[PDB]
Amino acid sequence: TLNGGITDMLTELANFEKNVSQAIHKYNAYRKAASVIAKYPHKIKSGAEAKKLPGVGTKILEKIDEFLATGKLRKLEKIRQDDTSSSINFLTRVSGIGPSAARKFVDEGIKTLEDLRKNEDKLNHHQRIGLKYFGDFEKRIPREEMLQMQDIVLNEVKKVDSEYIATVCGSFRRGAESSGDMDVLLTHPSFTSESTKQPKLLHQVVEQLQKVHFITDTLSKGETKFMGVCQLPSKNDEKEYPHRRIDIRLIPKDQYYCGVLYFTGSDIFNKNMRAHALEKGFTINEYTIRPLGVTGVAGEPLPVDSEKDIFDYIQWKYREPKDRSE
DNA sequence: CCGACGTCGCATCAGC
DNA sequence: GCTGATGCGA
DNA sequence: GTCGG
Ligand SMILES: Nc1ccn([C@H]2C[C@H](O)[C@@H](COP(=O)(O)OP(=O)(O)C(F)(F)P(=O)(O)O)O2)c(=O)n1
Ligand SMILES: Nc1ccn([C@H]2C[C@H](O)[C@@H](COP(=O)(O)O)O2)c(=O)n1
Ligand SMILES: [Cl-]
Ligand SMILES: [Mg+2]
Ligand SMILES: [Mg+2]
Ligand code: NA
Ligand code: NA
Ligand code: NA
């Protein structure tokens, strides 16, 4: 990409602030700056040019000038050399180990993959499965494999109840040629914002996907959100496919458009869009868009009959999913 | 200057 | 057990 | 770290 050096640098800084500094707003600020620079259609020649972009301020402008002149960032070099930052940044790559747990592990001398494997009993269940599949979860999924995973999920869901509709969102819905994982939005007419007239609606689907050995592990599971692991079947004598992260979100059927807007993302696009809603006097979650009174308190949900209706309320032109990869 | 920064599900824990 | 952080994840 | 009142 045109400015990959800069955006990689800002991403590394974002990860440092989140994992080591535990500064969530600095993390979001760095990621916002990297996103807006990543879609900028010119090769950036100076910090001043970058600072014209929203989300890029004086401090990042200076870092961009350092990076353009030398090819590196001293602040990052020194972070790379720091053993505590390095260990913390590694441990947070395990699903379920966040900033707090990583600093606690390092305090107890648990700082390497070998250390984690030695101390499996010091891990909660999520962390245990994240360590089990640590290698696999850093692999990406070719769209071709996403299409085979789609086929299984949709056909197994149809076998449980033909009135389910499963929609693959995430980067897949944005048309990406590869995805980090699989995101499945699920609806059923028995579950609306007005009533839940059938229990176990998410459970039954998970059960069936476990039955056919597609779902292999569970990280967390409640009435509307499953977070787990899945794997495509491989042919005779073939090496197995990597295990993959899968997230399933059951959304009230009448709130599908807010739900599919949310689960299609990207995460940065969602933040930017919801922040624009707030400036426009609305609040958007995965269920509703609601107005804000002078109070500052959310009012009643507005009528939504398409993704575009949500864009219309906040005075944004519609953006197809493929144009939301911020 | 400085308050706001997206929103929420599930797991875990502390306090009652 | 419940309720309200807090952690970690989407 | 950046932005907007
Ligand atoms: N902090 C977040 C994370 C995710 N999300 C939403 C948007 C996002 O697209 C959806 C799925 O989360 P993923 O982490 O799987 O992101 P993704 O868009 O599918 C992706 F591109 F990162 P992936 O292909 O690597 O999974 O959940 C969000 O709103 N806020
Ligand atoms: N998972 C899904 C996907 C679509 N739908 C419904 C919402 C709309 O009535 C209709 C839109 O179809 P589509 O947007 O996929 O062309 O399907 C649903 O209820 N659950
Ligand atoms: Cl709501
Ligand atoms: Mg995804
Ligand atoms: Mg603001
Ligand atoms: Na700027
Ligand atoms: Na992690
Ligand atoms: Na996901």
Side-chain angles (χ1 to χ4, degrees), chain A residues 1-60 62-293 295-326:
Chain A
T1 57
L2 279 185
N3 301 284
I6 290 168
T7 61
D8 284 352
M9 167 191 71
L10 299 176
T11 298
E12 194 167 345
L13 287 171
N15 288 332
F16 169 81
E17 292 306 343
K18 184 184 180 177
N19 300 332
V20 180
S21 303
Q22 304 189 26
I24 190 57
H25 299 302
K26 282 189 181 185
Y27 160 80
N28 286 325
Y30 274 124
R31 287 235 291 156
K32 180 176 176 173
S35 175
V36 74
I37 281 169
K39 66 179 180 202
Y40 183 60
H42 305 273
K43 179 164 156 166
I44 290 169
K45 292 171 301 230
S46 84
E49 173 189 1
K51 189 175 178 312
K52 290 204 169 53
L53 306 174
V56 181
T58 304
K59 302 281 287 293
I60 290 171
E62 299 196 17
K63 292 178 164 62
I64 287 174
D65 282 330
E66 176 169 349
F67 182 84
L68 287 162
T70 67
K72 52 211 193 292
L73 200 67
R74 278 127 74 223
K75 178 183 169 96
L76 275 183
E77 291 180 9
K78 296 185 183 135
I79 291 161
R80 280 153 162 155
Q81 308 170 41
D82 181 84
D83 295 0
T84 296
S85 302
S86 289
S87 299
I88 285 170
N89 269 330
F90 168 69
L91 294 172
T92 58
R93 289 165 62 192
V94 182
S95 190
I97 306 189
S100 181
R103 199 172 275 282
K104 184 153 184 303
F105 283 137
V106 164
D107 281 358
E108 303 153 348
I110 304 176
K111 313 148 51 186
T112 73
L113 188 71
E114 319 89 64
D115 296 341
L116 286 171
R117 287 176 173 166
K118 290 196 317 228
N119 287 272
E120 245 195 291
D121 53 342
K122 308 268 182 282
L123 300 185
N124 69 29
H125 173 73
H126 185 148
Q127 295 163 343
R128 199 187 173 104
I129 305 299
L131 169 63
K132 185 183 185 184
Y133 300 115
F134 173 77
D136 278 357
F137 291 176
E138 295 216 328
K139 303 179 180 277
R140 302 194 51 87
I141 307 175
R143 188 176 190 84
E144 188 188 273
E145 290 182 32
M146 292 290 289
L147 294 166
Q148 306 168 240
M149 298 160 68
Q150 186 178 46
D151 271 335
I152 298 176
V153 169
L154 268 57
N155 272 291
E156 293 306 320
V157 153
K158 175 151 49 185
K159 280 165 200 187
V160 183
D161 194 321
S162 72
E163 291 200 300
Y164 282 118
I165 310 171
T167 310
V168 180
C169 305
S171 61
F172 178 86
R173 187 163 186 263
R174 309 200 302 272
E177 285 299 298
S178 65
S179 299
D181 65 10
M182 164 162 285
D183 304 293
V184 186
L185 191 165
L186 188 67
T187 69
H188 193 280
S190 277
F191 174 50
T192 68
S193 57
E194 221 50 65
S195 57
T196 297
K197 55 184 70 99
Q198 227 177 290
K200 299 192 192 107
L201 268 185
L202 180 56
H203 180 86
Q204 291 161 226
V205 159
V206 170
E207 210 180 67
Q208 174 75 14
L209 289 172
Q210 285 165 345
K211 186 181 143 49
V212 301
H213 310 283
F214 183 65
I215 283 180
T216 61
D217 305 85
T218 294
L219 305 182
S220 69
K221 180 181 173 290
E223 288 191 63
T224 65
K225 187 159 72 65
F226 177 83
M227 188 178 313
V229 183
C230 65
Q231 180 188 36
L232 282 178
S234 50
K235 302 181 176 292
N236 286 344
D237 289 4
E238 283 233 290
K239 196 175 104 73
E240 290 194 352
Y241 287 97
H243 286 73
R244 312 298 195 179
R245 281 273 295 106
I246 179 162
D247 295 312
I248 304 173
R249 187 65 196 266
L250 171 71
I251 293 293
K253 191 183 169 71
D254 59 301
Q255 302 178 320
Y256 162 76
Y257 292 116
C258 285
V260 74
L261 175 66
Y262 153 75
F263 225 20
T264 296
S266 65
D267 57 345
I268 302 310
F269 173 84
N270 285 347
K271 279 181 254 169
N272 289 347
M273 186 169 182
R274 297 181 177 195
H276 184 75
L278 293 174
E279 296 171 354
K280 283 296 181 163
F282 305 84
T283 176
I284 301 165
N285 58 21
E286 64 260 59
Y287 309 114
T288 65
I289 174 166
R290 300 164 177 253
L292 297 168
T295 80
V297 156
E300 288 300 307
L302 298 163
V304 175
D305 318 284
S306 65
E307 292 186 77
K308 173 169 180 296
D309 280 344
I310 305 159
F311 288 80
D312 282 337
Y313 282 112
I314 70 176
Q315 296 183 300
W316 267 10
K317 271 156 183 176
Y318 183 60
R319 287 168 61 185
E320 301 291 337
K322 75 205 204 309
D323 291 311
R324 316 176 193 163
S325 297
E326 315 200 321

